[PDB]
Ligand binder design. Structure first.
Ligand SMILES: Nc1nc2c(ncn2[C@@H]2O[C@H](COP(=O)(O)OP(=O)(O)NP(=O)(O)O)[C@@H](O)[C@H]2O)c(=O)[nH]1
Ligand SMILES: Nc1nc2c(ncn2[C@@H]2O[C@H](COP(=O)(O)OP(=O)(O)NP(=O)(O)O)[C@@H](O)[C@H]2O)c(=O)[nH]1
Ligand SMILES: Nc1nc2c(ncn2[C@@H]2O[C@H](COP(=O)(O)OP(=O)(O)NP(=O)(O)O)[C@@H](O)[C@H]2O)c(=O)[nH]1
Ligand SMILES: Nc1nc2c(ncn2[C@@H]2O[C@H](COP(=O)(O)OP(=O)(O)O)[C@@H](O)[C@H]2O)c(=O)[nH]1
Ligand SMILES: Nc1nc2c(ncn2[C@@H]2O[C@H](COP(=O)(O)OP(=O)(O)O)[C@@H](O)[C@H]2O)c(=O)[nH]1
Ligand SMILES: [Mg+2]
Ligand SMILES: [Mg+2]
Ligand SMILES: [Mg+2]
Lengths: 290, 336, 284, 285, 290, 290
């Protein structure tokens, strides 16, 4: 795989990706935080093939956390084979065994919606091990379910961790500050005001006037949201994904097309962001239409 | 029978708790203001999202969830009827912080004297919290929450809930409640005032350093070095700057509200603070007595026992910003 | 397409939105035939009235990921990994890619949607359907075995708007789901024509719509407490008249105390006078 | 059976009109109203044949769970077997007899979590979704060969009570699927008065008692919040103890007030004994 | 092994280290509480080699508590064998038996992130026996799952216990005051002001003015944290670990590098820390950048 | 077993120990209720030897309760073999049987940290028999796990039960109902202002005035704690055991030795106590240092 293969369709600036790859090679653990709809899940699979340099899914494992996810499933735990229970090497443990086999090649573990599951309980022993300076046999630790002290588990040096955490929910946040230190936090923006976003639209036979009107509209709307940081921070701001998909057939993005999507998706979304002000709902919606 | 306009009191509570438009609401009385803040305040939180704290659950279920506890599993023989005792983390809004809100809202609804619009809106909210369990609130519950794990916003409304619970009295009916006439009693209003300044001064007087200072008597006694019987003396506030120090004693009296004899009993405490206080820098020592008045504000200065002391008043009920201007104007003169 | 009381435009909107987006939420008060819409609609997209393709479930507060997708549960011998319905259902559609298999979820609001769906909360998106986006599941014994939504799957969500929960708001799930409101449709001819084809009086149908709508406007009057999501549905009138009893004021009066009166109580709680007032307005 | 029931005949007509169409129903009333006896006579009334076999009764509690109700795994001599519950076995009994109406009685329904017990079935019991078309495989139905469907013939009656102020608003699950009916104590009814004149009660003693209980029942229901209409006393205490062989009399009533009404009055108010002493004495005379 | 080797690179004052051994050797159970990034994990491995006087791993054992450790895991519990359960001696019991195998040479048990788990549940009987006075065969006790035949378990005198409780998570704080008496609590400071931190940078190609400004700004910032106590207490203040790492290749410290640190990791930390006004965030971020 | 050896070293008044012996012979179910560091565990070992009049381990048994403790271990229960289940006589069942052999000789059972475990889960059926009046063969009961009704278990009159409970946690504000009826609570004072504690300090080369200054502050400080009930009750107050320890070398008490204890034990302890008022910590901590 190569870098420019990714950048063709990617709306994120190159500076961010180089910023991302610079940290990740150093820190070995990163968190991409932004609102939904900016390609977090999209980039993460791409970035892995860049970092490895080869399009190998075998070396990549991609998982989505949720409430009913535990250390027993993730790392190690006792589970029923049948009549008799057995100790089950979890998925992350299995991934680490594979990466050991090929120390040269980078192996990458991608966790979507990380903020949901109780990370302290899930990672546990890993919470110390995962740090860039603490990887290797020197800091090897025996596990909970290890038969004896001799059995010890150490993260390989090659391992890189990428986490995707939406900023839409303040309820679910990485408040565990000790965990925050391990991860290098990389903000990601909606990225309306980019050429690559604009060129994709023009590539789909789109009006340059309508496009420049669109970017100015959303940028102003997003700015209104970020202002009221008490109520809604920048983390809530709308992403570009609503506009991206749905044009695969070849439908031109006319003003009528914009009018439909606003009615179905953004309009009720604005109701939630602005529950108290109905006037504010009509104002921004009609601004797009007018 | 003069008292402060009620809307102004809420601002003093705000600095007291250390953390909006109140012009719109038409109910002057306190509980109308207070409920509207809470009733509107909760609506602000849910927009961002309420706190969900992982409560681990050890329960008997028909299957594996999370970690099975082998001991309780075998001893109770739950394997035989296809069950295990397993530990897992249900995610609820049933936390103590959130439970307190719902119980307080029930009290708010039950209150005999309340605006109809306010009561109707809360009853919706009470319905909107199905999972959370109502509780009979005590300060001991509030005591556990002094840890302050919750966000900064939660702490604001929780302090509000503290005010309501303590200031709730049954009225005509067995079920219903009636709000305490807070303004009338001087002690709690005075104790509010003393706290109001201390947190206020830290905010605005960034130039100066503001801390409450404990003081020790110069006395020695042959009987006891402890001198425990002697009165405990802790300043209301001290607002120290490099050029000049200043001690303040502030209290709320009813007699002073009438525009005659003057109630300045607190002054007797003040000189003794000056005496026990000894400055290493020796820049200066100053004192201030400040009281609340309704109609107008008057400032005097005195040179009593080698100390420069000011007696001053503030016209509460004037306007909150002009009051805020007046307070900064006042301290600026004496802090010199 | 004949007995539906909803405009042809709304269903025309839905089919384009459904085919395009592949996931939708039909949100409205109870009694508007949300279930009948989806059940009717599901057969349309298939093109044939096939019920085996369509599966319906009713979420509830205790519903869990153990039931839906995967889970460890006991066989006769002991515990095993038990493939949940949706995993079984997607396998069923995986068997036949060409035909369209549909999944209907009622009372969705009650359960903590993030908790139940979990892994598929990402995968369900129309773009992320296929082997490329597959992920290993939580309880998957081996990392190599993964789960992916097929392209044929379409999901329809039916939500009661009368119990808003200020517990968890998720704007990310809202990205997957394109939300569609549904009005009761008293004014619509299709509801009227049905009753007029049941030996109703022409004025009586006209009288009914005026009476009920005044209540709905009053319900939607106070946006903070209540809304269009709360307002009354029509389905109560549909049922009970196919025996042969034509509409009459007494028939309405039966429904009023039977059905509407608790709803009013729930909505206009602790205000009996408003209940007696609005109840009595309808009888005249 | 009709005449023996003490409630207005009009309500009896109202209920079957609801149940036959709605197929799910819940009765909420004070304790001591004969809610169990009501449903039984009503259950036999709907069938018309007075068969107890058709009728089966269960009383819910918080421990009550899906394994007891529907299906679960129970220990064998060695190992364990799948053990069919009441409702699973009950419905298949009615499956043979489609025409024949079969009834299920759920007492103290509000205590338990309806969702937890029913599980899957909570939608299938809603009348719109009934019969073979709406089949669902059960949680423990390991194979896909067999599915559980509740047939149309089933009718479900629930006995709930408004006794306790601790109870909050009813669970939302119930409201959707169930029609709520409030049952009056029925003192005023002639059928209860003819049940005491049949025992040679004095009309003054009868007329006084009807006014007397109403006088308390009016007062207890006057309270808006703590004590509502649901609190007011029912008539069942008066039945048991009269047709056993003992005639009505003022002393017979006097014993009963001490027996049940006097402690019950304490529980409801639980604040003022003087208020209790006033009313308890007032009841005697 | 000796103190000069250990204290060669450590940024902690000598004051604590001898103070630690003064408290440790008399009391034998301690807790090192400080925010993350002050070398709590870092020193603890080094301290173990001092007391034994040698660099030996066998006499040392290292573990982390992840809110799922239990008495069944720590001390005595039952594990599935092939068809049926068996009794397994936990790691601590396994460790103590080795520790009393030779009393002369000291044995250390290291428990990272001790604050998390419900320690009363984990230790059980041991909470009494751990204390220095109540050690040896005199205070021998039979365990819960011990055999009916009397066999008793006592903490040997040689054992020393070290705990590492971070001070960020307030909720996860020891309120089992009976247990907090068993341990002696040693505060560890961030370490900016100390020269041994400063000297490390200057040795690695750093300007003193840029260095002294950096420490000057951080200590001002940390006091603002120390000023507050409601949410952000004294303990929350930033550690020195962020600046320690990432310079191994030869990258000199400069405002560009400092700008990378501040934008990438700390600036997210501050907004989570304050979450009231961005201006406080914009102020302090710009101060560090300035 | 002479009292002179027993009671001289002890700090507790001879008044309370005698009363303890009165109720203990009378009622045989006793609870010592006081904060940690007042010698609850220390007295209990001595009192048993006092009552027996002899130093015998067999007649005396000691245990600490915790959440994992259960009926199945305490009294009777089934432990799995490799496949099969074998019944096992528990401790108290095994212990009383020894006491049955020697009914005349007194036997003692000591339960430390009793509140941590629910008594009902452990004792269960035996809480009826455990009571002082309902003992002996007259009140005998057959056990849950007994093969037949014939086998019966009765608490012999000779055994006395001691339970050590600490009033240091908010959970214990709601004392368990089972304890109050069947056990007789005794309050253990902190005991700073005591002759023997002072005489102990003077014996270890301590200045008299320094001792008296110390006690007044602790006695004054403990009064401050006792005044509150909401957060800190009377039971929260400091015990007398921080100062006992650490002088075995012979190092004299002084401000230097005191400073170690305050900073490492009492200073952070106060931080947990007085979270709301940090100044209160400085107010008291500095007061003690002076
Ligand atoms: N074609 C194209 N699509 C993009 C680009 N950026 C984002 N998207 C699209 O937006 C959709 C979602 O990507 P995703 O990473 O899952 O967004 P997200 O923020 O993670 N969503 P969520 O947080 O809800 O999981 C996909 O259609 C993705 O391809 C882009 O640059 N080009
Ligand atoms: N070279 C060097 N590195 C130090 C020094 N002090 C701390 N560090 C580094 O800072 C990083 C983290 O130290 P660590 O012990 O893990 O801190 P911690 O308190 O244990 N972390 P946590 O609280 O999150 O568990 C490591 O790179 C560590 O080596 C030091 O004095 N010299
Ligand atoms: N020499 C001497 N030591 C005492 C005296 N009182 C307590 N101690 C010492 O204090 C230390 C701990 O006593 P202990 O009984 O364990 O307190 P505790 O109540 O059991 N602690 P906890 O409540 O935490 O379990 C021991 O060294 C004990 O001997 C005393 O009067 N004299
Ligand atoms: N003809 C016709 N019947 C309807 C319509 N809406 C609902 N019904 C019938 O009303 C009954 C109950 O519908 P249901 O799904 O339970 O109500 P909902 O889920 O709250 O929307 C079924 O017989 C529906 O088919 C409609 O719009 N037209
Ligand atoms: N004969 C007759 N008995 C009645 C009537 N109503 C109630 N009862 C009697 O009252 C008793 C049942 O009362 P009930 O309230 O269900 O008892 P509870 O469930 O404990 O509250 C039985 O003796 C019933 O026969 C009635 O109308 N006629
Ligand atoms: Mg995504
Ligand atoms: Mg660490
Ligand atoms: Mg002890």
């Amino acid at each position: 795989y190569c870098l420019e293969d990714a950048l063709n369709d990617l709306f994120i600036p190159e500076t961010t990706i180089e910023t991302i790859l610079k940290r990740l090679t150093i820190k070995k653990n990163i968190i991409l935080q932004g609102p939904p709809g900016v390609g977090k899940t999209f980039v993460a699979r791409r970035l892995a093939y860049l970092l490895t340099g080869e399009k190998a899914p075998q070396r990549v494992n991609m998982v989505q956390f949720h409430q009913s996810y535990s250390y027993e499933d993730f790392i190690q735990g006792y589970r029923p084979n049948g009549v008799g229970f057995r100790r089950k090497d979890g998925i992350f443990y299995n991934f680490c065994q594979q990466a050991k086999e090929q120390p040269e090649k980078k192996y990458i573990f991608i966790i979507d919606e990380i903020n949901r599951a109780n990370l302290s309980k899930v990672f546990g022993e890993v919470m110390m091990l995962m740090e860039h300076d603490k990887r290797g046999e020197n800091w090897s630790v025996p596990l909970t379910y290890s038969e004896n002290d001799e059995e010890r588990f150490y993260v390989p040096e090659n391992v890189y961790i990428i986490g995707l955490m939406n900023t839409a929910d303040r309820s679910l946040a990485v408040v565990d500050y000790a965990l925050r230190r391990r991860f290098s936090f990389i903000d990601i923006e909606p990225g309306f005001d980019t050429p690559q976003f604009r060129n994709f639209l023009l590539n789909k036979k789109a009006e340059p006037s309508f496009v420049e009107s669109l970017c100015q509209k959303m940028n102003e709307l997003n700015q209104e949201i970020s202002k009221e940081a008490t109520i809604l921070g920048k983390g809530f701001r709308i992403g570009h994904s609503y506009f991206c998909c749905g044009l695969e057939d070849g439908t031109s993005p006319d003003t009528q097309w914009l009018n439909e999507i606003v009615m179905t998706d953004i309009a009720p979304l604005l109701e939630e962001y602005f529950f108290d002000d109905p006037y504010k709902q009509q104002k921004w919606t009609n601004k797009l239409l007018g | 029978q003069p008292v402060i306009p009620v809307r102004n009191i809420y601002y003093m509570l705000t600095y007291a708790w250390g953390y909006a438009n109140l012009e719109a609401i038409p109910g002057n009385n306190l509980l109308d203001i207070l409920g509207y803040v809470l009733n509107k305040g909760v609506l602000q939180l849910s927009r961002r999202g309420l706190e969900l704290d992982y409560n681990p659950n050890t329960e008997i279920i028909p299957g594996i969830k999370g970690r099975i506890e082998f001991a309780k599993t075998i001893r109770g023989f739950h394997l035989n009827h296809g069950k295990t005792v397993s530990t897992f983390d249900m995610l609820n809004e049933d936390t103590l912080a959130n439970r307190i809100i719902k119980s307080t809202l029930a009290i708010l609804i039950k209150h005999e004297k309340l605006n109809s619009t306010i009561r109707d809106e809360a009853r919706s909210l009470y319905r909107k919290l199905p999972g959370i369990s109502t509780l009979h609130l005590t300060p001991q519950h509030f005591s556990y929450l002094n840890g302050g794990k919750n966000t900064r916003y939660y702490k604001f409304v929780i302090s509000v809930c503290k005010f309501i619970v303590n200031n709730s009295i049954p009225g005509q009916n067995k079920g219903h409640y009636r709000f305490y006439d807070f303004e009338r009693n001087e002690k709690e209003m005075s104790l509010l005032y003393q706290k109001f300044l201390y947190e206020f001064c830290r905010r605005e007087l960034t130039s100066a350093n503001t801390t409450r200072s404990y003081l020790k008597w110069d006395a020695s006694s042959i009987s006891d070095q402890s001198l425990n019987l002697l009165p405990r003396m802790e300043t209301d506030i001290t607002i120290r700057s490099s050029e000049k120090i200043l001690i303040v004693d502030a209290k709320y009296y009813k007699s002073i509200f009438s525009r005659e004899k003057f109630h300045s009993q607190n002054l007797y405490q003040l000189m003794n603070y000056l005496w026990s206080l000894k400055p290493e820098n020796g820049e200066n020592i100053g004192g201030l007595l400040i009281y609340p008045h309704v109609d107008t504000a008057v400032k005097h200065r005195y040179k009593i026992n080698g100390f420069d002391i000011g007696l001053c008043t503030v016209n509460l009920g004037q306007e909150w910003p002009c009051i805020h201007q007046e307070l900064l104007d006042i301290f600026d003169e004496y802090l010199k």
